[PDB]
Structure formats: C-alpha cells, structure tokens
Design a protein around this ligand. Structure first.
Ligand code: E3W
Length: 273
C-alpha cells in the first residue's frame, strides 16, 4: 500500500489545472530523506474528493498497481495524503509538465527525430506494461511527462515518463468516454467492459498522432455525436503534416483489437524508420 503522508508536511501552491473529478496543484513536501537530512521537495498533488468514493477507489487502485512496477519510464508516486476531506496522490514534480501543452508551445522547434525518440520511449514503457499484462487505459499526450528537454549541444535526447492511469473508463460516465474519442477505442465505446491490453495499442496510436501534430487534438472540431459517427463509419485519422509515423498510427488504430500489433513489433517498426 502507499506510504501515508501527513497534511502538516504538505504545502499547497499554484493550481496546475483540472482533470475529470481531480484537481492538480504544485506543492512542497517536508520530509526526512537519506542520512536523516531534512528536505523540502517540490511535489505534484493530484486531489480527489472523498465523496466520490468509486472514482477515488478506481484512481488510487490504478496508481497503486502501476507503482508496484518500478521502471525508469513510469512516474514516481511518493505516497498518499488522507488527513482531511480529500484523497491526495503525492507525486514527483516533473520540470516541464505534460507533453500536449509542451508540444503546442514548441511546435515550431521540434523536428522528426525529437518525435521519433519520444515515440520509442513511450513504446518502451508500454512494452514493459504489456509484458506485465498491466492495462494503463488512459494513454494520451497529456499523460506523458517530460523529465528533461533535448540538449541541443551534447546530443542528449529528451526523456519522458508515463503518468498514473487515473480513473478507469469502466467507471466513468459514458458521456466523458464519448468526449474522449478517439483516445478511447471503438470497442470500449460499444462497451467499457471491453477494456483490454489492446486498448492501449489504439490509444498509443492516437498519442503518436498528437506527438506528430504539434499537440493538436484529433477530431476536436467534432462534437460528441459526430465523434461517435466517426467510429460508426470506420474512419481513420488524417496523416499528420509530419507524416513519417502515419502508417504506424493507422496500424495501431485498427478497429479489430486482435489485429493491433504488439509493442515489441511497434518498437521494431519504430527502429526501422
Ligand atoms: N507529475 C507532474 N509533474 C508536473 N509538472 C509540471 C511542470 C510545469 C507545468 S506548466 N505547463 O504549467 O509550466 C505543469 C506541470 N505535472 N505532472 C503531472 O502529473 N501533470 C498531469 C496533469 C494532468 C494529467 C491528466 C492526464 C489525463 C487525464 O484524463 C485522461 C484522459 C485520457 C484521454 C483523453 C483525455 C483525458 C487527466 C484527468 O482528466 O484526470 C489528467 C496528467 C498529468
């Protein structure tokens, strides 16, 4: 289970946005670290209302399950704070935040090799999950965290991590799932119980599309009703302007879940380009 963190050791600072049934804040945690040194550590605070019991259970069970699998490409969770009326996930603060807004702010100065390298790391994180038969269920560019930027000089690549899974689409309202087309796969719109490892292959493809599109949101011009009709007419996303990954995207966004390629096969495809 998660280590418990006292409210008196947490300082809440600025709001870093809102999620569906979660609030996000930058904060500070006071802690005794290695060798007994006192630290004040920047933390990311994800906050759920204790009154949303089924949402909180799904969120924190998902965070717990992924945190049992330590890995360089999976976000680090320090623990949970439960002292008041809120369940709080106390998470590592990533310097550059979520990839979707980073892409929008830097689209002009991000070339194909930066995108290829990010795709390979994300696929490596998903292969590790696939080998452990653990479903993430909410892969998107907003759930990629950028630890470190590319070093233009010393040829250092960027480095990313995958954020915690969050509330399962098996317990969310159907209208939120519909709004999350085309990240949510067509078989889960049909029935959220079809959530399966194949789900993360579809969403991975949607996430590559985000990565290659400077952080545009695919199908954002379509309201929920037309988003459904998109899946009904078996359409595929348009090739991004930088289209080098378009074939891979469409191969991943296969309407037959059993046909979506393994992440081992995705990695080999990525290495060939
Ligand atoms: N650990 C960490 N460190 C930092 N540092 C940081 C540094 C600078 C800046 S900045 N840009 O202000 O300067 C900002 C942050 N950020 N961080 C996070 O974890 N952020 C974070 C925030 C929201 C999310 C997130 C992702 C997906 C979500 O839904 C699923 C979904 C699926 C498909 C389609 C839609 C939605 C939701 C939700 O709806 O609940 C929330 C993830 C990560």
């Amino acid at each position: 289970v998660f280590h418990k963190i006292r409210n008196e050791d947490l300082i809440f600072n600025e709001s870093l946005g809102q999620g569906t049934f979660t609030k996000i804040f930058k904060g500070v945690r006071r802690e005794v670290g290695d060798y007994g040194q006192l630290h004040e550590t920047e933390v990311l605070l994800k906050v759920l209302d204790k009154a949303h019991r089924n949402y909180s259970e799904s969120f924190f069970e998902a965070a717990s399950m992924m945190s049992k699998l330590s890995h360089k490409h999976l976000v680090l969770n320090y623990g949970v704070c439960v002292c008041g009326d809120e369940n709080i996930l106390v998470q590592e603060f990533v310097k550059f935040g979520s990839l979707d807004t980073y892409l929008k702010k830097n689209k002009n100065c991000i070339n194909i090799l930066w995108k290829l390298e990010v795709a390979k790391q994300l696929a490596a994180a998903m292969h590790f999950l696939e080998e452990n038969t653990l479903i993430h269920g909410n892969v998107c560019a907003k759930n990629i965290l950028l630890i470190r930027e590319e070093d233009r000089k010393t040829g250092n690549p960027p480095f990313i991590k995958l954020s915690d899974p969050g509330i399962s689409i098996t317990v969310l309202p159907k209208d939120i799932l519909q709004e999350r087309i085309p990240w949510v796969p067509p078989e889960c719109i049909e029935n959220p119980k079809n959530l399966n490892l194949a789900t993360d292959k579809w969403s991975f493809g949607t996430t590559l599309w985000e990565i290659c599109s400077g952080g545009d949101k695919p199908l954002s011009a379509l309201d929920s009703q037309r988003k459904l009709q998109f899946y009904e007419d078996r359409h595929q996303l348009p090739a991004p302007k930088a289209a080098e990954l378009a074939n891979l995207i469409n191969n991943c966004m296969d309407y037959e879940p059993d046909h979506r390629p393994s992440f081992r096969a995705i990695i080999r495809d990525l290495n060939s380009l």
